[PDB]
Amino acid sequence: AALEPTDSGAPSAIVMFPVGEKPNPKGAAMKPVVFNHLIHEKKIDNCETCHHTGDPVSCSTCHTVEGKAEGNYITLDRAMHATNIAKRAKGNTPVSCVSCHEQQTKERRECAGCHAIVTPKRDEAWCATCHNITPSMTPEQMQKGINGTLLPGDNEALAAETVLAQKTVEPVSPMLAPYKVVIDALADKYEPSNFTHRRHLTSLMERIKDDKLAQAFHNKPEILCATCHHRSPLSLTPPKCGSCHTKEIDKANPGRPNLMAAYHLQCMGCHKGMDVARPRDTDCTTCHKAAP
Amino acid sequence: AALEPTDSGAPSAIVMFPVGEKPNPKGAAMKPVVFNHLIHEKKIDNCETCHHTGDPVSCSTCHTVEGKAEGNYITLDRAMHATNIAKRAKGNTPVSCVSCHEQQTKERRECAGCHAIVTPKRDEAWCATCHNITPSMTPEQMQKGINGTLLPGDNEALAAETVLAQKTVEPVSPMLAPYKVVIDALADKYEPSNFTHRRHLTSLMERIKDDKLAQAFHNKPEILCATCHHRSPLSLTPPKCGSCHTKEIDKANPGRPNLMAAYHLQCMGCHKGMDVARPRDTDCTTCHKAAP
Numbered sequence A, B: 001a002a003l004e005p006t007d008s009g010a011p012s013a014i015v016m017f018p019v020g021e022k023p024n025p026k027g028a029a030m031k032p033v034v035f036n037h038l039i040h041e042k043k044i045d046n047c048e049t050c051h052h053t054g055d056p057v058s059c060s061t062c063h064t065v066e067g068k069a070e071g072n073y074i075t076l077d078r079a080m081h082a083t084n085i086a087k088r089a090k091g092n093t094p095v096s097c098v099s100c101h102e103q104q105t106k107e108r109r110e111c112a113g114c115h116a117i118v119t120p121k122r123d124e125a126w127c128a129t130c131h132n133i134t135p136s137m138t139p140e141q142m143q144k145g146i147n148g149t150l151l152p153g154d155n156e157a158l159a160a161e162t163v164l165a166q167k168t169v170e171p172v173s174p175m176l177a178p179y180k181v182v183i184d185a186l187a188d189k190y191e192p193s194n195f196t197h198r199r200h201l202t203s204l205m206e207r208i209k210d211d212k213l214a215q216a217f218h219n220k221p222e223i224l225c226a227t228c229h230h231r232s233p234l235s236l237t238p239p240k241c242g243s244c245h246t247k248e249i250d251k252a253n254p255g256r257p258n259l260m261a262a263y264h265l266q267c268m269g270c271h272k273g274m275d276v277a278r279p280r281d282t283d284c285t286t287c288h289k290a291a292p
């Protein structure tokens, strides 16, 4: 028993290596990337969405580490991670691994609520989602991979081993977070906001529970907490918004909204991002009843 | 157990809690911080340097989480982490935990070379260097520290268990990195640069091998490699500078220096930061001899 074959004829899973002309005898590089061609080709209908030149060929044939004429000196690095890709007035607009994943988060309603307010860390755990080779790869295979003298038979074995060894990280249950939270730090013109904490988290999670792209990148058990509880270590008891966001203006931290704007911008930000019908940003009592 | 008594009378080590107005029954907060008064007072001479209002009292007496008139509304968060602190005309210019530590890396020659070119990540591992309590602390104890009803002997106990469980990360030996590196990616007007890789690393580590501040914050075995090999997952075989820095200016990545500038800015940046006498920025042939 092996990986399921593709309709396209491309290998089901593929190790991608840092291909360039320059010798790399010490194997100075990121871990290589195992790309699952099978699941991507099933999800994305047009081959040439990715194979933007119409050549059903490895990107690295034109995009090398240093760059070359066949790819107009757009490097491997650029081709795989580019985020600011200009629309092409004629013919195909290329995509990168990173730009397409990001477009997914902006374009799909079930993703665009959280992703309207998340700021991604882009840390080691992020890189490792792709830079993910199996440990059984040898330095020798690495050189061969780098030199392009690896046999596809060996490439595919390494790739199937990695894929078969992958395990999806389970998000913690919303049962381990508060049922409700009475937000009353600022209560004055209005009553406290009775935020449906667990209802909200449960709902957001259910809409993405089987998404393979979300599952790969949502890769620490408490990472979804950080959607709102941002910029602090993942934890089942994060610090309060009011620890960092002051009630009055904080000249020392102009990037920081004051605490009322913090709640408004975050709550309303998601609501707008995934087109919540109620409450509207102009509805001033649904989130907090007027005080008597 | 107990730790070495101080000359000053302050407890040797102290648990600091998120002290403020409003009730926090769930302990929604960062881990408390255990401050080692002993080592600090043996290094910083004047008490007023820290206890900027003279009388040595807990900072959160004036700097609460929410902030109050007694601290000019400067919150606990600002008090502990402030980096943008104005020279005080009259009297004492206050310091923060973060600001003093930053000053050290800038004012000590043995630190200012590396720290002239590193950009700190300020990630979880950074936070945890101070937010560091022993797991033996109980919710209940958390509540008492927050409400200010925890017994001093109980505070002292907590801190001592924490301090006595602490461990230092030992950096990887320079024997696990290249002895020398022939930097030839751009070789043209000049011969390659025969970089004394292990000697540079070994020399830099030597000057800081006892330093307790560096030891706490250099808290991954391969983190010192990141001084130069930045912005990639820690590894004994980091990618080449060239993978990310293009020979010519990346118009897609305007902020990125091109490869020659990367080298020049990095090598000369440190040299200047720790006043290296030679090579000067103008001693071109000292880093790369003129080509035949």
Ligand code: HEC
Pocket: A008, A009, A010, A011, A014, A015, A016, A035, A037, A040, A041, A044, A045, A046, A047, A048, A049, A050, A051, A056, A057, A058, A059, A060
């Ligand atoms: C983006 C989501 C892709 C879609 C849609 C399709 N392909 Fe692809 N393919 C993609 C990548 C990132 C790569 C490069 C992997 C590498 O080895 O460097 C590939 C590779 C191929 C290849 C080359 C096989 C190899 O050299 O090992 C073939 C033959 C190929 N893909 C063809 C192909 C076809 C026919 C597709 C539509 C049915 C198709 N791909 C979709 C990314 C993507």
Ligand code: HEC
Pocket: A050, A051, A052, A053, A055, A057, A058, A059, A060, A061, A062, A063, A070, A071, A072, A074, A078, A079, A080, A082, A084, A085, A086, A088, A092, A094, A095, A096, A097, B252
């Ligand atoms: C040679 C036959 C190529 C192959 C195979 C792949 N790409 Fe390519 N890429 C190529 C050129 C000549 C160009 C410039 C086209 C233009 O409109 O100017 C590009 C550019 C890209 C880009 C855009 C970069 C930017 O605009 O900043 C990306 C992101 C890109 N290429 C990615 C990419 C991927 C993922 C490929 C494999 C699936 C791939 N290219 C193959 C030439 C060639």
Ligand code: HEC
Pocket: A033, A034, A035, A036, A039, A040, A043, A044, A049, A050, A080, A095, A096, A097, A098, A100, A101, A104, A129, A130, A211, A212, A213, A216
């Ligand atoms: C859109 C045109 C994409 C491009 C280009 C790339 N990826 Fe992607 N990826 C995309 C989708 C829509 C999905 C989910 C598929 C599904 O069945 O829902 C994914 C998923 C991934 C994953 C997670 C699945 C896994 O194999 O673990 C990874 C790690 C991944 N994608 C990597 C990846 C790389 C390395 C790419 C460039 C070579 C890349 N993707 C391009 C959409 C698109």
Ligand code: HEC
Pocket: A101, A102, A104, A105, A108, A110, A111, A112, A114, A115, A118, A119, A120, A121, A122, A126, A204, A205, A208, A211, A213, A214, A217, A218, A223, A224, A225, A226, A227
């Ligand atoms: C809130 C409950 C979320 C929902 C629903 C979705 N995403 Fe998410 N995502 C969330 C967080 C808090 C994070 C971590 C931020 C960080 O520091 O990295 C992420 C991260 C991702 C990523 C990686 C970061 C990026 O590239 O932007 C990807 C690719 C991603 N998320 C995809 C994704 C998709 C496709 C979703 C809808 C199916 C989706 N997520 C929903 C939080 C939440």
Ligand code: HEC
Pocket: A172, A173, A174, A176, A177, A178, A181, A183, A184, A185, A195, A197, A200, A201, A222, A224, A225, A226, A227, A228, A229, A235, A236, A237, A238, A239, A240, A241, A242, B026, B028
């Ligand atoms: C936004 C959609 C959130 C997500 C996802 C999670 N939390 Fe949350 N939580 C959120 C808010 C706006 C608040 C109020 C904070 C304030 O200072 O006003 C909270 C509160 C908590 C608390 C504190 C409860 C209390 O009684 O004070 C805890 C312990 C908490 N949140 C935990 C938590 C965890 C573990 C999460 C991921 C599973 C999580 N939160 C998700 C908003 C959001």
Ligand code: HEC
Pocket: A117, A119, A228, A229, A230, A231, A232, A239, A240, A241, A242, A243, A244, A245, A254, A255, A256, A257, A261, A262, A263, A265, A266
């Ligand atoms: C300190 C550890 C923080 C806690 C706790 C929370 N936030 Fe925050 N937030 C913080 C910073 C440093 C910044 C400024 C970012 C910058 O670089 O400018 C912010 C910013 C916001 C924003 C603006 C949009 C954004 O960049 O995310 C909002 C809407 C916001 N903060 C809201 C918010 C809420 C509601 C929180 C409790 C759940 C919260 N933040 C916690 C630092 C910290």
Ligand code: HEC
Pocket: A183, A184, A185, A186, A187, A188, A189, A190, A191, A192, A193, A260, A263, A264, A267, A268, A271, A279, A280, A281, A282, A283, A284, A285, A286, A287, A288
């Ligand atoms: C949910 C999506 C909200 C909407 C829509 C509005 N507000 Fe809001 N508001 C929200 C929270 C979570 C909080 C914090 C509650 C607390 O007491 O700490 C607030 C706060 C305010 C406040 C300050 C608190 C008070 O005076 O009671 C004011 C003055 C306020 N909100 C004004 C306001 C108006 C005018 C709105 C309609 C445009 C409105 N809020 C919407 C959440 C949400």
Ligand code: HEC
Pocket: A231, A232, A233, A239, A240, A243, A244, B016, B017, B018, B019, B028, B029, B030, B031, B032, B033, B065, B076, B077, B080, B081, B097, B098, B101, B122, B123, B124, B126, B127, B128, B129, B130, B131
């Ligand atoms: C030592 C140099 C610290 C580093 C590094 C960081 N913090 Fe800190 N923080 C420090 C102290 C002495 C205190 C007071 C004691 C306490 O635990 O309250 C704090 C306090 C906070 C707070 C406010 C209290 C709370 O809500 O728990 C926050 C929100 C906080 N610290 C956050 C924080 C984060 C996210 C850090 C890494 C980015 C971080 N601190 C670094 C000292 C030190």
Ligand code: HEC
Pocket: B008, B009, B010, B011, B014, B015, B016, B035, B037, B040, B041, B044, B045, B046, B047, B048, B049, B050, B051, B056, B057, B058, B059, B060
């Ligand atoms: C900064 C490097 C300091 C120097 C120099 C000195 N002290 Fe200190 N002290 C400092 C901190 C961060 C704290 C706060 C602890 C807390 O719980 O908030 C303390 C604590 C004390 C105390 C205890 C006060 C109390 O907790 O009620 C005393 C009595 C004290 N410090 C005295 C003191 C003297 C006399 C010093 C000079 C010889 C001195 N401190 C140096 C920070 C720093």
Ligand code: HEC
Pocket: B033, B034, B035, B036, B039, B040, B043, B044, B049, B050, B080, B095, B096, B097, B098, B100, B101, B104, B129, B130, B211, B212, B213, B216
């Ligand atoms: C200068 C005026 C400082 C202020 C204010 C604070 N710290 Fe500090 N820190 C300072 C020095 C010079 C040293 C090393 C002293 C030596 O013996 O060489 C340190 C050390 C630390 C450490 C690491 C050692 C340890 O105790 O684990 C930590 C974790 C630390 N400092 C924490 C800390 C906190 C929490 C502070 C604010 C409450 C704080 N420091 C103030 C110099 C100065």
Ligand code: HEC
Pocket: B101, B102, B104, B105, B108, B110, B111, B112, B114, B115, B118, B119, B120, B121, B122, B126, B204, B205, B208, B211, B213, B214, B217, B218, B223, B224, B225, B226, B227
């Ligand atoms: C190069 C060999 C270094 C020397 C010599 C010193 N430091 Fe360092 N330090 C270095 C790196 C690569 C990092 C990691 C940055 C990150 O991403 O966290 C650090 C980090 C620190 C920190 C933490 C960040 C900060 O608050 O600035 C501190 C406090 C620190 N280093 C202290 C320090 C001191 C006091 C030094 C001289 C005795 C010193 N550094 C030397 C690299 C190197």
Ligand code: HEC
Pocket: B183, B184, B185, B186, B187, B188, B189, B190, B191, B192, B193, B260, B263, B264, B267, B268, B271, B279, B280, B281, B282, B283, B284, B285, B286, B287, B288
């Ligand atoms: C060490 C501190 C240096 C000093 C002083 C100067 N240069 Fe440099 N330069 C350095 C390195 C590590 C490299 C990369 C070497 C390689 O082959 O990759 C360079 C590169 C150059 C180059 C390009 C390579 C070549 O043409 O051979 C040029 C044009 C260059 N450096 C010029 C230059 C001049 C004029 C300097 C004095 C004013 C100078 N460099 C200083 C390291 C160092």
Ligand code: HEC
Pocket: A025, A026, A028, B172, B173, B174, B176, B177, B178, B181, B182, B183, B184, B185, B195, B197, B200, B201, B222, B224, B225, B226, B227, B228, B229, B235, B236, B237, B238, B239, B240, B241, B242
């Ligand atoms: C700056 C003072 C550095 C520190 C600290 C470390 N390295 Fe380094 N390294 C540095 C340069 C300028 C280069 C040249 C890379 C290039 O692309 O031009 C290197 C090179 C390496 C290499 C590759 C050498 C080869 O023959 O290919 C490796 C494997 C390497 N470095 C590893 C390494 C490790 C593990 C380090 C910490 C223990 C480390 N280096 C630190 C500059 C600096």
Ligand code: HEC
Pocket: B117, B119, B228, B229, B230, B231, B232, B239, B240, B241, B242, B243, B244, B245, B255, B256, B257, B261, B262, B263, B265, B266
């Ligand atoms: C991609 C994974 C990189 C590798 C490998 C190296 N560098 Fe880098 N460098 C990178 C980025 C994305 C940036 C821009 C950050 C910004 O704020 O714009 C930089 C920046 C530099 C600089 C300028 C100062 C700085 O911000 O650090 C220098 C001097 C530099 N890079 C040099 C450098 C060298 C010599 C490298 C090999 C040892 C190297 N970088 C690797 C990303 C990446």
